[PDB]
Design a binder for these strands. Structure first.
Ligand SMILES: [K+]
Ligand SMILES: [Mg+2]
Ligand SMILES: [Mg+2]
Ligand SMILES: [Mg+2]
Ligand SMILES: [Mg+2]
Ligand SMILES: [Mg+2]
Ligand SMILES: [Mg+2]
Ligand SMILES: [Mg+2]
Ligand SMILES: [Mg+2]
Ligand SMILES: [Mg+2]
Ligand SMILES: [Mg+2]
Ligand SMILES: [Mg+2]
Ligand SMILES: [Mg+2]
Ligand SMILES: [Mg+2]
Ligand SMILES: [Mg+2]
Ligand SMILES: [Mg+2]
Ligand SMILES: [Mg+2]
Ligand SMILES: [Mg+2]
Lengths: 117, 7, 70, 153, 66
RNA sequence: AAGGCGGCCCCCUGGACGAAGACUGACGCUCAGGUGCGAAAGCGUGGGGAGCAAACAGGAUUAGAUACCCUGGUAGUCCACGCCGUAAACGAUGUCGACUUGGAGGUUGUGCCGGCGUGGCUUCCGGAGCUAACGCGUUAAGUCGACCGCCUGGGGAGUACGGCCGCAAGGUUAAAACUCAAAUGAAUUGACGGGGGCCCGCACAAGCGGUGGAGCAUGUGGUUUAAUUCGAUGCAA
RNA sequence: AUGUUGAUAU
């Protein structure tokens, strides 16, 4: 609706799933897409390809706002870290920054117990 | 079991 | 890690420089480490084992340099 | 095989048109070593196709193959019980091999009178993208695109 | 490698000397290993204490993202 | 000292080490009983409770699944004070002292001028010697001395009974009958592994044609018979 | 992911 030239892409690349939210620089969400939303479930959902498609659909979601340049904020260890960023570049945008914003505690809280698979 | 083997 | 894409830089190059920065800071390794709790005994055992590997490498590495295979 | 010292065996070209592509088609059609029988069915069928198109025999055959030839296919890799159908590019030799095999398989399950007719009709449907052979090509492409995720290992 | 603090013959690393301390942190703000910088163990311990004092006084950052 | 101890700052405080002397003058070593400290879990009283998580619940998986996996989740994990007194509390190696070839480090003092010494603690290798062997090897499992603790086939049993301790959980001290001809350590050759590596075979894959259904031939099993002669009967009848 | 068992003596 209201035009935003300069935006921020946030990539929540978990092991199971990739969420791409494009916000403005004040962190207000304009649109989003997920690998899970984009016709991939289970094994396929957690692929770089499913994240690629999620990124494309997120670009289409924010076509109206007229975003030109993006700062990328990458989070988490997932498959869809780099494939997401390539896709946002491939879908028009000028990538100005790339920044890892993965939370790391400086010690923090005891993680869950190891899985005995 | 089998009321008591290897075949 | 925090890449400014500099003026007159290909994205592909800048992305490679981001991968470098993350692998240098060791973000993914840090995440995988902290995914599950490691008991202190487990932590200590792997630290010991890693040291012994590197040592038993170093000594036996020199042995390979000396002796002929053929 | 393991040692993997397998070239290509010398296929003699067909007598009529001198096409090794068509010589392979006869082989794929042939049963019980009855090559003479197979050649007659093909040449009969190509004649019929050449009339209905007015394209030439080999050229009408090429249009049939062009539509039935696959580009990608899936190969099964089992990963922890579940079966990952990984898409792979088909090599040019295998493209023709699959194209021809599908056409003959399609023709054989038709309910026309002779094989030569069944074959002519299937090549005709292939050229206009209607028959079971192009449906097979579509199905193979469908699975490949469905499993495009697993291509990028 | 080689240790600058042995070379100069320093007594304390000093938390106030930010120009020096900045050489022994990463871009991320993390303290660099002695195996990388070639610092002597004794000074590495002093340097860590100095960096941690500086981080408290907000002369150095804790991390790249504040 | 052991258990253990990890952001930064201050306060109180213990030990170790080194260099120069000076001082006391065998004041030492060990130590049954005794006393203290002693991970985690646990217990009591009062706090706290983010994250995690016995129990528990649900979802899966499965023949079942009172599990592993998933979603939750209470005690607990945290603090104060008190209790418990045990751990593969391990170097499975008691303490103290002396002596006996080397090499490469780490760490922390120090002397002489980057080198050359000299102390402390420590990691790895290895010589003699020792050892059943594995290995240990100046930080000994070598060579000796002092004192203490402890063992005497496997099981029954670290159990019973009694005592002591404990709020309890239990701890601690600690038998017997009975039963067996073993149980055990280290190493050796194999074999095996849902261990690793490297290879091969129509072993998979890629294909083509079959078998399993039909009728018949034929063999076998079974049943039947007076007899249905005897043998072959996973692959390899 | 899971994925049990193999009568006695010789
Ligand atoms: K049973
Ligand atoms: Mg989890
Ligand atoms: Mg005593
Ligand atoms: Mg406790
Ligand atoms: Mg309590
Ligand atoms: Mg309470
Ligand atoms: Mg759980
Ligand atoms: Mg004990
Ligand atoms: Mg012991
Ligand atoms: Mg040794
Ligand atoms: Mg008892
Ligand atoms: Mg008692
Ligand atoms: Mg096969
Ligand atoms: Mg049959
Ligand atoms: Mg018989
Ligand atoms: Mg006989
Ligand atoms: Mg017999
Ligand atoms: Mg078994």
């Amino acid at each position: 609706r209201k035009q935003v030239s300069d935006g921020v892409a946030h990539i929540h690349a978990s092991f199971n799933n990739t969420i791409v939210t494009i916000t403005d620089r004040q962190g207000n969400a304009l649109g989003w897409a997920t690998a899970g939303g984009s016709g991939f479930r289970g094994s396929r959902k957690s692929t770089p390809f499913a994240a690629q498609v999620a990124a494309e659909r997120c670009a289409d979601a924010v076509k109206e706002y007229g975003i030109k340049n993006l700062e990328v904020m990458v989070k988490g260890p997932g498959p869809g870290r780099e494939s997401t960023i390539r896709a946002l570049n491939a879908a028009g945008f000028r990538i100005t920054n790339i920044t890892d914003v993965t939370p790391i505690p400086h010690x923090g809280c005891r993680p869950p117990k190891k899985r005995r698979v | 079991x089998x009321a008591x083997x290897a075949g | 890690p925090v890449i400014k894409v500099r003026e007159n830089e290909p994205f592909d190059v800048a992305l490679r420089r981001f991968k470098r920065s993350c692998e240098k800071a060791g973000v993914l390794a840090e995440v995988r480490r902290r995914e599950f709790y490691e008991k202190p005994t487990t932590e200590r055992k792997r630290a010991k084992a890693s040291a012994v590997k590197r040592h038993a490498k170093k000594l036996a590495r020199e042995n390979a340099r000396r002796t002929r295979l053929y | 095989p393991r040692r993997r010292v397998i070239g290509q065996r010398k296929i003699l070209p067909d007598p009529k048109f001198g096409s090794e592509l068509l010589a392979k088609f006869v082989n794929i059609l042939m049963v019980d070593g009855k090559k003479s029988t197979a050649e007659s069915i093909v040449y009969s069928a190509l004649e019929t196709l050449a009339q209905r198109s007015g394209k030439s025999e080999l050229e009408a055959f090429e249009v049939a193959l062009e539509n039935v030839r696959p580009t990608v296919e899936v190969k099964s890799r089992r990963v922890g019980g579940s079966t990952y159908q990984v898409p792979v590019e088909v090599r040019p030799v295998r493209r023709n091999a699959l194209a021809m095999r599908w056409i003959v398989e399609a023709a054989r399950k038709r309910g026309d009178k002779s094989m030569a007719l069944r074959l002519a009709n299937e090549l005709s449907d292939a050229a206009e993208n209607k028959g079971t052979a192009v449906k097979k090509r579509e199905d193979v492409h469908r699975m490949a695109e469905a499993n495009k995720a697993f291509a990028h290992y | 490698k080689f240790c600058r603090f042995t070379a100069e013959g320093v007594q304390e690393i000093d938390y106030k000397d930010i120009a020096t301390l900045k050489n022994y942190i990463t871009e991320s703000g993390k303290i660099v290993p002695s195996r990388i910088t070639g610092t002597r163990a004794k000074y590495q311990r002093q340097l860590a204490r100095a960096i941690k004092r500086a981080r408290y006084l907000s002369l150095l950052p804790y991390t790249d993202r504040h």
